[PDB]
Design a protein around this ligand. Structure first.
Ligand SMILES: Cc1cc(C)c2c(c1)sc1nncn12
Lengths: 193, 198
């Protein structure tokens, strides 16, 4: 079933819902962004209500919670993208087919890393786009150029994989996931430098 | 929600089940195969019982069944692979990031053949050191499809002015399909593994 904080979708399966500034949900997401991006200007925040992406994500979450025998497999991370990818992500999520720690989709711990113009490319009017993403990072190891999946947890058990890779395991600043339904885009932040 | 005909797996999540010649299950697969591969001989057929792959597959099938207009979204297709790939496929399914370039490319995804003869070629089902060839029988969510193009990394849109409303798969020929390409995870469930030889 669809999370409690969602709003009614009149029997539809997809909706982008603008948050009211100063209400609790808006303040919580705004604070995560302004922790490292307080010099920027927030035009709006939208909640992504994608029923199909949510269902597929929650399945993979239940599966990861069984496989790893604990429930700290999920992290809140950031993803900067160009305005032309936004409609695709809203509808179909992150696609690795669209890379120094591997050929997957990249998420940042800090909004400031996602805020770089090379990730959240400014459009004509200077508008920049960053997602807040639920990511199933699960059990992770250091990444390396050319990975197509995470490496195995043991060379003698070649099909038992890590869930994600990172730049640095003691102190991660990015995570790379290699499979379709391992990230759910929860909020879109429209903002300017 | 695991199928009732599956072997009980105690509390384990994966099992390869050897089928018995003379079973309807084994004979329907042998028939589908020998229809185009009458010169080869089947060593065995195993049923792939992968709980996790099955769940994620059945969620995608329910979504495509809701999305499309009462369509028949699922076809049973073949996929020849090398011995080295078989443990990965059994466990994790078909990964487009690992796919070969096909000799006639209609997109960058995972390829599935209508006819066992196509999959039976040494280019796909590479003979192992003991001369065994491997081909999967695969449930594929082909849905609504179009003729693909070598450049595709996702299916094309139905309508260029609505870029995110996609076809489900592509084919070589919409009038006589012989290949399908899929571009997403959990859109194909590997149901049976056929081991065979010349
Ligand atoms: C190396 C790398 C590549 C990308 C694409 C990336 C990051 C780091 S952090 C971030 N936020 N959105 C996108 N990205």
């Amino acid at each position: 079933n669809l999370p409690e904080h969602w709003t009614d979708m009149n029997h539809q399966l997809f909706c982008m819902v603008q948050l009211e500034p100063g209400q609790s949900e808006y303040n919580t997401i705004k604070d995560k962004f302004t922790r490292t991006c307080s010099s920027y200007a927030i035009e709006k925040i939208e909640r992504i209500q994608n029923a199909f992406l949510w269902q597929s994500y929650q399945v993979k979450k239940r599966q990861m919670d069984i496989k790893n025998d604990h429930k700290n497999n999920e992290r809140l991370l950031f993803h900067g993208t160009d305005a032309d990818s936004v409609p695709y992500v809203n509808q179909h999520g992150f696609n690795r087919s669209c890379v120094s720690y591997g050929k997957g989709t990249y998420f940042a711990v800090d909004a400031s890393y996602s805020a770089k113009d090379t990730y959240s490319k400014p459009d004509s009017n200077g508008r920049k786009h960053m997602y807040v993403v639920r990511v199933l990072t699960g059990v992770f190891t250091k990444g390396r150029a050319g990975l197509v999946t995470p490496p195995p947890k043991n060379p003698h058990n070649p099909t038992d994989l890590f869930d994600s890779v990172t730049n640095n395991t003691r102190s991660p600043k990015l995570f790379v996931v290699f499979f379709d339904n391992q990230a759910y885009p929860e909020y879109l932040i429209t903002f300017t430098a």
